Amino acid sequence: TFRRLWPTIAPFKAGLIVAGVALILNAASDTFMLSLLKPLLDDGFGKTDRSVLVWMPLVVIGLMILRGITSYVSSYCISWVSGKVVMTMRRRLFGHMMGMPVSFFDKQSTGTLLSRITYDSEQVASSSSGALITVVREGASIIGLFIMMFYYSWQLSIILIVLAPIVSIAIRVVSKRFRNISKNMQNTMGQVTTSAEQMLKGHKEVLIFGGQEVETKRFDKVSNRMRLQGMKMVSASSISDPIIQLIASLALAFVLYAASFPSVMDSLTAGTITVVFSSMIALMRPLKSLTNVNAQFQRGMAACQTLFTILDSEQEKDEGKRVIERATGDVEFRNVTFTYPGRDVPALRNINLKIPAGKTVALVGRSGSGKSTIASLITRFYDIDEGEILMDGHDLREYTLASLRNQVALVSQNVHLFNDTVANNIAYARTEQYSREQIEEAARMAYAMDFINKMDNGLDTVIGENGVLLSGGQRQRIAIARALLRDSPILILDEATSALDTESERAIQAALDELQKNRTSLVIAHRLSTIEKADEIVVVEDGVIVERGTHNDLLEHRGVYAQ
Amino acid sequence: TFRRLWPTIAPFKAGLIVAGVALILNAASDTFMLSLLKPLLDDGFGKTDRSVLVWMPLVVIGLMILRGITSYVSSYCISWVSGKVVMTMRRRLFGHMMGMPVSFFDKQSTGTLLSRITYDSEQVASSSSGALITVVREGASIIGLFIMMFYYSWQLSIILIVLAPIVSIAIRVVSKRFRNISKNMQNTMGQVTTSAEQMLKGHKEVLIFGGQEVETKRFDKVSNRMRLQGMKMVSASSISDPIIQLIASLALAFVLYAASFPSVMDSLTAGTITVVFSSMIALMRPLKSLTNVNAQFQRGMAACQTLFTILDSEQEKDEGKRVIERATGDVEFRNVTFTYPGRDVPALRNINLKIPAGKTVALVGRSGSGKSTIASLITRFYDIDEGEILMDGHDLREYTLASLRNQVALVSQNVHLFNDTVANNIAYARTEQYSREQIEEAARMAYAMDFINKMDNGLDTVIGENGVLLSGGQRQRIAIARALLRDSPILILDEATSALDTESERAIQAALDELQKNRTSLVIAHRLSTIEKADEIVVVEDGVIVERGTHNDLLEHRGVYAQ
Numbered sequence A, B: 001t002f003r004r005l006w007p008t009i010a011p012f013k014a015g016l017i018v019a020g021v022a023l024i025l026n027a028a029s030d031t032f033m034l035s036l037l038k039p040l041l042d043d044g045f046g047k048t049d050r051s052v053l054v055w056m057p058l059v060v061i062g063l064m065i066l067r068g069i070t071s072y073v074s075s076y077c078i079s080w081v082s083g084k085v086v087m088t089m090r091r092r093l094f095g096h097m098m099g100m101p102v103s104f105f106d107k108q109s110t111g112t113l114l115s116r117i118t119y120d121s122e123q124v125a126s127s128s129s130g131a132l133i134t135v136v137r138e139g140a141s142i143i144g145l146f147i148m149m150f151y152y153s154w155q156l157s158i159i160l161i162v163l164a165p166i167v168s169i170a171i172r173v174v175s176k177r178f179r180n181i182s183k184n185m186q187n188t189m190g191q192v193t194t195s196a197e198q199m200l201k202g203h204k205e206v207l208i209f210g211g212q213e214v215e216t217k218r219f220d221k222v223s224n225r226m227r228l229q230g231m232k233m234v235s236a237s238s239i240s241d242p243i244i245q246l247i248a249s250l251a252l253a254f255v256l257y258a259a260s261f262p263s264v265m266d267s268l269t270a271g272t273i274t275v276v277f278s279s280m281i282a283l284m285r286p287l288k289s290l291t292n293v294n295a296q297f298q299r300g301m302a303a304c305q306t307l308f309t310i311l312d313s314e315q316e317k318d319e320g321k322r323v324i325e326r327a328t329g330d331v332e333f334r335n336v337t338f339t340y341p342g343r344d345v346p347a348l349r350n351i352n353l354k355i356p357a358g359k360t361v362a363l364v365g366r367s368g369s370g371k372s373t374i375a376s377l378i379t380r381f382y383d384i385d386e387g388e389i390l391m392d393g394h395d396l397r398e399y400t401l402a403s404l405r406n407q408v409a410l411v412s413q414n415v416h417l418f419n420d421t422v423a424n425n426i427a428y429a430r431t432e433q434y435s436r437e438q439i440e441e442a443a444r445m446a447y448a449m450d451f452i453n454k455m456d457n458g459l460d461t462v463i464g465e466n467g468v469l470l471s472g473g474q475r476q477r478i479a480i481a482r483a484l485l486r487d488s489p490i491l492i493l494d495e496a497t498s499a500l501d502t503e504s505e506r507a508i509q510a511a512l513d514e515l516q517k518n519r520t521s522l523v524i525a526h527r528l529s530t531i532e533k534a535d536e537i538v539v540v541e542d543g544v545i546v547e548r549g550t551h552n553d554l555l556e557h558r559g560v561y562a563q
């Protein structure tokens, strides 16, 4: 439905009427130029008069100055409406996927929704504004070329106004045929493209098992299947326009044969028969464009109703009303059982896990099928199915989501770096209240500044993409710095260090023990240093915990934790 | 570049002459139709004949049956040439891409290199065949129209052959301006889509730090920078064609004003004035295309030199002549040191590692330092820098590389499945010598067959992409069946199935222990049962050997065996 999209375009109505009257005036500029062919052959090369050939080059430049200006104005004042509309409805998309849950981002829709901001909204504004250019402009061309034809010779224009529905019907059925094989072939193109992607993706096993002559013989059958499909693109799209221009020229022959009729027709001068038989050649592109506009507008509305799936999608549930000033209370799981959205296997059994205030709790393992999931549930990235993760005596759903996520603070080696200054990157969404003094003391407290003070601009450098691209261990260091300035009683650590950097690890672990000196830390473990610094060690195997306690009690009976 | 591409198009040369003589006949069919306006305005309507006006409709259709036929013939016999040249250039890319090293596929060129098969190999012959349609057709239109003007009015055609270089120069400089702005803007379009991508990959750690109103104040400054950049296309792509058709209309008005002179007029009849003023309107699309063919042919040959580097890159080095029928000898690492291509840190330091025949060398190390690296070195995926790995008494280089990889078979649940039959997936690269009795017995030895006994078609179903999409465990078990039938003397198992499965592992472990009861089997260890079953455990951590010996000696001296 177009009526959903119209309140977006409704503020920019003036550009649609200024260019709307600059498309009628553009199509009444080549119409009044084909109407100059009557007083050129009748009055300049019929009756000999040089006078019409004196001002005729002047109006020929005049109508082309008008046509050029009116073509620039209409293609700027529509592409300002169709630029501001896509700007508005893609910055409304972005404001609706910054509140839509992580499970929506977690492989329900991948990073290709970048293309659903950049391409799928430009295609709406370029197929609904290109379907107004060929409705106003070619509609005014059809209207104006059927006035000057009716003014000069009504006898041929009656035949033409009969025949032009027949030529439009022919254009519709011939274009609908190509639209049938194309949208049917689309699937075999997808199959034949993934069939060549798959063999290239298995390159290593191709070289190992020795099928560099079998896979060659299989690429002699899929490339031959791409060739024999690309030749059916051109056996269907290049039979279309020869058929269209032959049915259309049958109208060019019927009007020409009807102009041989002795008395009812053939009272037409040379200029009149030049105007009628040159407007007909100029009637072919208005007839082609006005017949295929509904297959262009419904390529814009088919993407607009694709974009509005997101605009009516459910955002993240902020169904809580209480605000946490500081989470001094200890967060504790209570009968919590969780299942991943989009899957049926549960990643969390019925588990009570207490994280005491000021005491770190380790998560020792590699995958666990639930280790990073447990870290995600405290931040409420994925909403809980049943159970209650009690936070200061109340469940997470009781609190407002922004104040809930203010208490938690993840730290990762794969942390995100914005295209901002490192002063604002340290203090994201806290630039106004938290001044530069707190930022520089917190950067010095985490021992970050030894890298920052030696940079090109100090605390003004751009770190992210199209930036200086700071180090992998410096990503965790800048995550310590963002974890600093406090107001974060809960810390989430992964430690993806792997290869420890020499002489920077001595400051990284110093800042890490500064991070874990107080406050309710929950760390997942790949380093035995964080393991022996842990207080209550938690180990999850195959999505469940059985064994808990400190390192000594888990060292008394080995199980799978010790080795 | 075209002199290197012409040996590929030279077998398909008969389609380029049939279409090349159909494009000329197509361009000489609308020229002979604009030559039908002289004996229609003079001999038809000027001198009232009625004999002219009945044969004229039959040549209106007579030159559109010809125009349609030669528009279909020349667009089927060039898209058969530019389908077969694409097919040959795809089969030759692929044959020079299953012999390339893995280091080419490893981060030197990612999964978009399939585009070089699909899009880029199509782009070269959709821009070198479209630059021949333009040269032959619109260069035969210019020739044809410029025969027709000099036949009909030589006075109003010397002016044309003066002005059409000036219009051609104008089109060239105006289109060069648009190409300059576009190829300059390209970088800023990439910058703004990157700066929109990076906010969207980081949805998490925006909700955490609270920046859901800072992020929509930065998208208000990049979506306002894609808007103002689309408005610089439409202020540069929409000022081009008005300027072009105003400069051309200046030439049209100069020719119209020159036809008012008594030297030029009184030799122009009422039909001659129509032909040299309707073929000039039909001279615009030949003049616009023939000054932009070099901006098309140099986008095809510049898309031909991004694929003739892959056709000129060095393949993987088979600089060996010895063949191994069966390698019962011990694989001995002798002073082997290896660094990754594209990086400077060594992923494998100076290492001596004994792999005994029939004994399992479990790599109990972790964190991705040198296990998957050494599993690639034994197969000679990436060639060695210094040192020598000795395979039955000689280095891998001395051997032919195909037999060297025939000795070794990787086993993984990350192994690739092809879109062939299951029996041919078990007997890949050898299905004619290896009969189906051996395939059935080897699938029975791997305990997988029952699942394929309950599949849809027995040992005949398609299993790859657009297939049944088998389980992760049965993928590892069908790799077991493959390595069982192929009888590889040296085994490399990765053990990606740390999370075991009920009812599958009872046969998976039996098949695994059946397979590694023999063979020089190096195994990457992540499951403690294979660690217990191992003979000589070798630890690798951050590039170097830590401990060597059985697990009891590693129990006596702990080190990182427990870690």
Ligand SMILES: CCCCCCCCCCCCCCCCCC(=O)OC[C@H](COP(=O)(O)OCCN)OC(=O)CCCCCCCCCCCCCCCCC
Binding pocket: A142, A143, A146, A147, A148, A150, A151, A152, A154, A161, A164, A165, A168, A287, A290, A291
């Ligand atoms: C999706 C598929 C598309 C298929 C497309 C098919 C196209 C078929 C044709 C459609 C357009 C037909 C337009 C007909 C216009 C006729 C105008 C006319 O006859 O006016 C000429 C007339 C002069 O005639 P004459 O008497 O010879 O001259 C002597 C001068 N005193 O007088 C004049 O000089 C001027 C008189 C002005 C009259 C204006 C008429 C406007 C017509 C508007 C039609 C709207 C189209 C549909 C929109 C629906 C809106 C609800």
